[PDB]
Amino acid sequence: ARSVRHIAIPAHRGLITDRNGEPLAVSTPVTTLWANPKELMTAKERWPQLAAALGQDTKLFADRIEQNAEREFIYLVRGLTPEQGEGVIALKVPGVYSIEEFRRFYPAGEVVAHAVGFTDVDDRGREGIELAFDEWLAGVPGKRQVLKDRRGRVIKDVQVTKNAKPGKTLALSIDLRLQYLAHRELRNALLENGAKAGSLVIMDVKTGEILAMTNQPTYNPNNRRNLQPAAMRNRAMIDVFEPGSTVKPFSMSAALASGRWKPSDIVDVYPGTLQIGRYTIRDVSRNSRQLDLTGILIKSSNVGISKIAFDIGAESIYSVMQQVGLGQDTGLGFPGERVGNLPNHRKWPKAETATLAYGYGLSVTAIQLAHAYAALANDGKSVPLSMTRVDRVPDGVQVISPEVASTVQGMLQQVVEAQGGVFRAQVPGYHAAGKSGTARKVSVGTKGYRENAYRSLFAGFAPATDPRIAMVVVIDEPSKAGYFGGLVSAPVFSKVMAGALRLMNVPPDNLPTAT
Numbered sequence: 001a002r003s004v005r006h007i008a009i010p011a012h013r014g015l016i017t018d019r020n021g022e023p024l025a026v027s028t029p030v031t032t033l034w035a036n037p038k039e040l041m042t043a044k045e046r047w048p049q050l051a052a053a054l055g056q057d058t059k060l061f062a063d064r065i066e067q068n069a070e071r072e073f074i075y076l077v078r079g080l081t082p083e084q085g086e087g088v089i090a091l092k093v094p095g096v097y098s099i100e101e102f103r104r105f106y107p108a109g110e111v112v113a114h115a116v117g118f119t120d121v122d123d124r125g126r127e128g129i130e131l132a133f134d135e136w137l138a139g140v141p142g143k144r145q146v147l148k149d150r151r152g153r154v155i156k157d158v159q160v161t162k163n164a165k166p167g168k169t170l171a172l173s174i175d176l177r178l179q180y181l182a183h184r185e186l187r188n189a190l191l192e193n194g195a196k197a198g199s200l201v202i203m204d205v206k207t208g209e210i211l212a213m214t215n216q217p218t219y220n221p222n223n224r225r226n227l228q229p230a231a232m233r234n235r236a237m238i239d240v241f242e243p244g245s246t247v248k249p250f251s252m253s254a255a256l257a258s259g260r261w262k263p264s265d266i267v268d269v270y271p272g273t274l275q276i277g278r279y280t281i282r283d284v285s286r287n288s289r290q291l292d293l294t295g296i297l298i299k300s301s302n303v304g305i306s307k308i309a310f311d312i313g314a315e316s317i318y319s320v321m322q323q324v325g326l327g328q329d330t331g332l333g334f335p336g337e338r339v340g341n342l343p344n345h346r347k348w349p350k351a352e353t354a355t356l357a358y359g360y361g362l363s364v365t366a367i368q369l370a371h372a373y374a375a376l377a378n379d380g381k382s383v384p385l386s387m388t389r390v391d392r393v394p395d396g397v398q399v400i401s402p403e404v405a406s407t408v409q410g411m412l413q414q415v416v417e418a419q420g421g422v423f424r425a426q427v428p429g430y431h432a433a434g435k436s437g438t439a440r441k442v443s444v445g446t447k448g449y450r451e452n453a454y455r456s457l458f459a460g461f462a463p464a465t466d467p468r469i470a471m472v473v474v475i476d477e478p479s480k481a482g483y484f485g486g487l488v489s490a491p492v493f494s495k496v497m498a499g500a501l502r503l504m505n506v507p508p509d510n511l512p513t514a515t
């Protein structure tokens with residue numbers, strides 16, 4: 001019974017910070033106390049003092065030790081603070097030992113839970129960034145030998161056979177300040193609107209960095225006691241949806257690149273419907289007989305966009321959408337991330353051509369939509385997405401001509417700023433641009449759509465004079481104060497964009513309305 005034992009030396013898991021060094025996941029030093037029952041059995045009159053110092057009931061504590069009198073090792077308590085373990089060891093109770101351990105702590109908790117994820121009881125990454133970069137972050141535990149006698153009392157630390165190796169630091173692209181702002185405002189809007197879920201993505205249009213990514217519902221990764229599966233989802237990355245009218249700027253980009261359309265062109269949209277075979281295209285706004293190109297986007301005419309689509313054909317539309325990354329692998333490798341679906345057909349009937357152009361029959365993620373709007377904002381130059389801090393600006397791919405992008409930027413500025421436009425999306429002190437959308441949710445137990453359940457969207461970027469930031473707001477089943485994208489999601493865009501631009505010290509380009 002007198003032999004040497006090898007015990008592990010816990011390795012320090014790598015620090016996860018935001019883009020500026022703000023800790024997001026940190027391995028904190030804790031103290032675990034263990035006992036040698038055989039030794040404690042000789043110090044019985046120290047039990048009541050020891051039990052009390054452990055916050056345990058004298059008798060229940062005594063039952064524990066007695067039931068284990070045979071054993072040489074049992075945990076007393078795990079994960080005390082260093083000073084708490086210091087106090088109990090200082091009592092000098094025979095057979096009580098301490099070992100230094102680590103506990104993974106998440107300082108911003110629920111604010112960044114979906115992005116960062118968490119580690120399991122073996123601090124192996126199980127969700128999110130903790131999972132995706134587990135190899136980078138994980139340390140290598142060491143090993144050492146201890147000598148124990150017949151009764152199991154430790155008499156000597158013999159040697160370290162293997163040093164512990166710490167994991168590596170990882171800096172995310174996220175700006176925690178923006179993440180806090182986005183988290184709070186999304187939560188507020190979810191609650192004001194009695195919505196079921198939501199996502200908000202902010203992107204640096206020049207660098208491809210994800211500055212903020214938040215979802216509702218969320219959870220506290222430091223306390224997962226009553227955690228339900230639904231709250232764990234990074235919906236921005238892993239859930240798909242039909243983008244609806246938020247793809248209209250890309251259909252318009254195809255129209256302009258085709259050589260067949262120009263901004264002054266007028267389209268007749270009377271009577272606000274278009275019959276094609278059995279299916280009917282319907283406009284919601286029906287207070288105009290004709291619209292120029294800009295007014296098609298301002299009023300969000302499905303009939304208008306459909307007529308342009310029939311003229312240019314589906315292939316030109318499919319092509320811009322593929323080019324801006326809709327339904328395409330993002331290359332981020334976030335666990336569970338979806339590619340979505342951009343349908344490719346042998347032949348395109350009018351029906352499928354029209355619905356593609358106004359954003360149904362395809363499915364995207366909120367990250368993809370934001371990336372697509374970044375391309376438009378960045379003068380038609382698409383840059384790869386990143387969830388880690390970028391050192392040097394990546395090489396972009398010119399996916400939309402600068403000229404077309406410039407015109408479409410102007411139209412989207414008009415969608416926000418012009419009379420009859422989405423005025424709730426106006427950003428104090430700035431010129432913003434963007435597009436609202438409203439989509440019926442898909443039926444649960446059949447094909448087709450729900451009658452009274454909706455997804456509210458707004459996508460945009462700012463400032464219009466030199467776009468820095470793109471943002472997408474998606475809100476599921478608002479039920480208390482309307483459901484249109486320009487009612488529900490646009491105000492979120494306004495407030496978050498305002499705070500974001502200020503936090504990033506972007507100078508106001510609209511002083512007639514500044515703060």
Ligand SMILES: CC1(C)S[C@H]([C@@H](C=O)NC(=O)[C@H](NC(=O)N2CCNC2=O)c2ccccc2)N[C@H]1C(=O)O
Binds near residue numbers: 246437484
């Ligand atoms: C409410 C609008 C002004 S309509 C138009 C457009 C774009 O998103 N959205 C729609 O046309 C949407 N259609 C829709 O969900 N589906 C599913 C199958 N095909 C079809 O039409 C809709 C929205 C509200 C009530 C009824 C229908 N933009 C909205 C905006 O800007 O908020």
Ligand SMILES: [Cl-]
Binds near residue numbers: 450451452453
């Ligand atoms: Cl319904």
